[model samples]
Target chain A: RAARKKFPPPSFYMPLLVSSDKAPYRVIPRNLVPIGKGNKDEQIGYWNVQERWRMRRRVDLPPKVHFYYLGTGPHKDLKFRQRSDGVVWVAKEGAKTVNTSLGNRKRNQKPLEPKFSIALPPELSVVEF
Target chain B: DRAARKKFPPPSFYMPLLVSSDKAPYRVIPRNLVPIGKGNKDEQIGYWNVQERWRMRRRVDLPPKVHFYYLGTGPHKDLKFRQRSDGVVWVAKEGAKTVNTSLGNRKRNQKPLEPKFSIALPPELSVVEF
Candidate 1:
């Protein structure tokens, strides 16, 4: 449910936070909260950005927030780290701001930009979501 | 008095606090939140966490079952008589001492006992009891 603030090097890609409604993502290596049931797993997995997009309108409720993790190696290693790696973002429905809230035992309340800003993880050549 | 001083050692432990996470605790997040960007926004921040019980009191030693009593008399009186059964409320500041334990102290395991308080009714109420 937490991250080692200063992570080990080789600078592994932690995870991905894809907002069902936006393109800009909150890229994480290993996400903050533990995901489950309504959060991550349910049938064909949450990695199906296509399913997410298609099911977006059918969701009945507003857009659902989803998460994914970037693996260490090639396409074969494109394991959807999902909730297991702690690389998932969380929220209720509509929030004003976005930032890492885990492992921050400090006075300052500020969020910074993510290091990488590309569509889809390096593993998958084309994820149509 | 030693004139020669030792070097201030570097901090032994480095606790890195990376507060910023990719996920915003709220649902309808933004790149940089303005008033109402798009959706119906209502989210609870980290500040909304339930107050930690530890912050209220440090109960490291006091046995959870030891119920302390209260003696009624002069000044230091509780304004709000309303309190929980588990909690004992008395005017701690004034001349107040505890009551003799109805249940005498024992050596071993004790069942959970809640603290209770008894005080002489104020002048008016005392008449009725008498």
Candidate 2:
């Protein structure tokens, strides 16, 4: 009875719609992190999920994906870029800055994950072949 | 004029491997339903079959040895499909026995003489029993 159900599990796939053009950020599924580790400036995170979905065929998520990353060092500002096809969302770490609130809490807690996925904007609704 | 920016483009392909101590013939098929894009109305890469009301969630190449997996008191709902990469035509879904048209397409005008594939016994046991 527990095994029978429809889906990719809506809990994981349903995107919470947003009205703004600049959508929020996402944690890359861990398996997709690129090589060379988080040794580089841009490469500053770890992977927690691999988008390679089960069964069927090819992956649905964008390539070279990364899942999630909390603020490691002192950092300020954050940004993301959507892939041309608009599946993957790449995060760019902004300049480093010390924070009174985040400074100590950062070491103990996990990076806050996006509970609600950002929805696709109107401009990105259609894709041309 | 164009300006500098960043992006996360759709992937050409992303296939993840399965991990488990219980290695079995069972495979995972993610559920997906979305608009792919426009093409010749009949030749769209997306799925729509008059024969079966079911639609394919994603488009991907299947391994030589693979089978759909499901559990119930009735006959197995699992399925398998085939298609050649030829870009010139329609899809056909047919068989001698009435089976669930799970998902997939064969050429509309063609049917290989030899049975392209045959269903085999699923290898994995139920993880839960009730």
Candidate 3:
């Protein structure tokens, strides 16, 4: 029988980080000294968003892209560049503040006009966890 | 010198490929060709960066089987060591000489000053996953 390696608790595992650059990733264990005087442990092939995309890896964007933030009620359900091209505005499950400027808005919002927003990239579309 | 002024060929190259699976070394992804916008914007923009490893160093040499040794004595006696020949650790360093070759001048097939670093991948890291 083949010996199985020891696994860590599920709570210790974290989601992959998404970024605009293509680079290898590492999921080092919490407080684990992977590279010190004695240990040279490594987990090399974990691909990131840019790496995956370069390798032709693709994932579907969520129906609505939502970002829940802290502040007041008017800034809770802050939608980013979701409506632009491949992006779709979605609601965050639990946002501290939300704004709905259009005539029709969500009941959870305080009704504020949209202004001073930023842009996004293809790299930011990954990591839905 | 004229030797340092010449432009050498690029060490890396790019190629276009369509990936049907995750087996490719790199990826071809469809992404927003432009910056993400919150207001009015273009309809489509997506490109993929190639995962080619041309610019990266490869482990094509043999495994480094030697351990470094250091020697020290008298007031100004300096000691230094390099695990392999042609390695950056010892090569071109002050007061450091000789390649980390254990063999004498008898064999001509290999030089003592040749780099000992290998570009071959280890079994655990080389295997591709689906």
Candidate 4:
């Protein structure tokens, strides 16, 4: 008899369709965090799920992409961005302040957000995550 | 001025088959069963024959997870297909004389048929094959 094979848990779960109107809106399980300050702002983030977060460290978002915030509730004030091809990147709220060696500094941090690029329509949709 | 966007932009190539009012916009052909070679008469014949059979199968509603088979060429000539409850098509291949161990004695050297490919189907849509 052959031995049964054990499969590892998925790195990321499937994206869920939150809304489907002019363009379908989907949400993933990751978030984004900012690493640098204004004007010279550099955003670095990681996957929100436990397995992926432990395995993968913080990374930068794709360069030349425009990031924005949601206009309404559920995920309002949260930062998100959409690619020209309609791939939406989102982030949830993180620590508002962090302790430093000198003193506590204000950190407007957010976790990484995930989205479906192929499952979603190519046309841009309103950010809901 | 904002330019008007195309009403129905072309969907992705791998998008699941969507149906409205009991009929799909296009026929759903199994990806593995599609003919690829150039000027291969045998492949073309097999493809069309399977397509005809699929057409007939599509006329009636099929329950989920029912096994179906198609005749093909090669070591794994017995192509079996089934659609799971979640709308994913599971495809597997087996030998012609393979017996069901659950019902009869297990034959020596008969390997179990494992699903080789899983094709996702559109959610909330009834599939033609089970």
Report the C-alpha lDDT of model 1 over B6-82, residue by residue, as the tens digit. 11111101111111223221211121212111112221000100001111142322111111112211111111221
The true-versus-predicted C-alpha distance at residue A101 of model 1, in Å, is: 16
lDDT of 1 by residue, A20-109 (tens): 333222332222322322222221111212112124322422222223223221111223422221123223322222222122213233
Candidate 4 CAPRI assessment class: incorrect
Which residue window of length 10 is worst by lDDT in model 2 chain A?
A5-14
lDDT of 2 by residue, B1-130 (tens): 1322223211211111212233322232112211223122332222111100122455332222211111110011111121111111112222112223323322223431221112222233111111
**Which residue pairs show backbone clashes in model 4?**
A30-A112, A30-A113, A31-A111, A31-A112, A31-A113, A32-A110, A32-A111, A32-A112, B83-B130
| Stretches > 4 Å off in candidate 2 | A1-40, A43-86, A93-129, B1-116, B125-130
Error of 2 at A43 (Å): 6.2
lDDT of 4: 0.25
As for DockQ, the candidate ahead, 1 or 2, is 2
In model 4, the Cα lDDT at residue B75 comes to 11
DockQ ranking of the models? 2, 4, 1, 3
Top model by DockQ, which number? 2
Better of 3 and 4 by lDDT: 4
* Per-residue C-alpha lDDT of model 3 across residues B1-130, encoded as one tens digit per residue: 1122111111111122223333321111111111122112221111121222222244232212211111111100121231211111111223333323221111222322211212332231221222
lDDT of 4 at B54: 14
Which fraction of the native contacts appears in each prediction? 0.00, 0.14, 0.00, 0.00
